[PDB]
Amino acid sequence: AEIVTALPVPLAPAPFYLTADMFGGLPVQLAGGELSKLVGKPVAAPHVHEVDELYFLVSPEPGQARIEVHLDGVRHELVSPAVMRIPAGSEHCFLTLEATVGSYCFGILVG
Amino acid sequence: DAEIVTALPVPLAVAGHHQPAPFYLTADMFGGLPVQLAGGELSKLVGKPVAAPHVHEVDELYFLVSPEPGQARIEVHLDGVRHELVSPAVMRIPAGSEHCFLTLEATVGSYCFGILVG
Ligand SMILES: O=Cc1c[nH]c2ccccc12
Ligand SMILES: [Fe+3]
Ligand SMILES: [Fe+3]
Numbered sequence: 519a520e521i522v523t524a525l526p527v528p529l530a531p532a533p534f535y536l537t538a539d540m541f542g543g544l545p546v547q548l549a550g551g552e553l554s555k556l557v558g559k560p561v562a563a564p565h566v567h568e569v570d571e572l573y574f575l576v577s578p579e580p581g582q583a584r585i586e587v588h589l590d591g592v593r594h595e596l597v598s599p600a601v602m603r604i605p606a607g608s609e610h611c612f613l614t615l616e617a618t619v620g621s622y623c624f625g626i627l628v629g
Numbered sequence: 630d631a632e633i634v635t636a637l638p639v640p641l642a643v644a645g646h647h648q649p650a651p652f653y654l655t656a657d658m659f660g661g662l663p664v665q666l667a668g669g670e671l672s673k674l675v676g677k678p679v680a681a682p683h684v685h686e687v688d689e690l691y692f693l694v695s696p697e698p699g700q701a702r703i704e705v706h707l708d709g710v711r712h713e714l715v716s717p718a719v720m721r722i723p724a725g726s727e728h729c730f731l732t733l734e735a736t737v738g739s740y741c742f743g744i745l746v747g
Contacts, residue, residue, distance in 0.1 A: 522718065522720075523717070536692070540719065541690075541721045545746065545747070546664055548692070576669075576740070577738075578737050589631060594633070596633065597635075599635070600633060600634070601635075602631065602633045603631050603632040608631070619696055620695075
């Protein structure tokens with residue numbers, strides 16, 4: 519049985535739960551984390567990937583988490599649940615506006 | 630102005646499952662994805678299986694996560710053998726294996742996601 523438990527893995531420094539090398543190779547990588555601890559961050563740093571990224575925002579009940587996604591100088595405000603595609607090349611980040619305990623935003627890099 | 634999906638989850642039927650499963654990524658989104666991702670919050674699933682044992686022709690990952698390590702536990706049946714997963718954990722289920730899971734323990738904000746890998 520193939521079980522990975524040494525998780526998340528820091529990668530440059532974001533917490534990964536799926537990496538492209540696991541289990542013989544994956545077509546996605548998946549990072550992210552619990553949002554309630556991030557409601558407090560006042561700033562986020564724009565960045566760009568060479569593959570598409572999907573943001574996946576979820577909370578125990580719909581509507582309990584809220585982020586702003588800054589994409590190429592446009593501010594978007596999303597409420598859980600929500601998925602948003604960030605095209606490769608695009609400058610982006612998000613800030614957490616609101617979150618109950620056990621709200622998550624995951625970033626999924628699509629190979 | 631990129632693509633946002635908020636009509637979620639998407640209920641799809643999956644073999645052996647009592648009710649439609651809640652999908653957040655499906656294969657046709659955004660021009661086509663190499664994965665599908667379903668699942669959700671476990672705190673009201675404790676003791677209650679979502680499915681009879683089932684088999685897919687694709688690999689499935691279970692991804693189990695909770696606000697703190699150790700707050701969620703599931704039991705995966707994989708071809709008659711029982712495995713306990715403790716958050717955080719990723720388990721690969723090879724295509725053709727008969728399987729399902731039972732939630733053993735979960736706080737509010739514990740999740741299990743099933744990831745079907747093309
Ligand atoms: O992967 C299947 C799954 C995980 N959580 C739920 C919740 C409800 C139906 C199906 C499922
Ligand atoms: Fe990103
Ligand atoms: Fe399955």
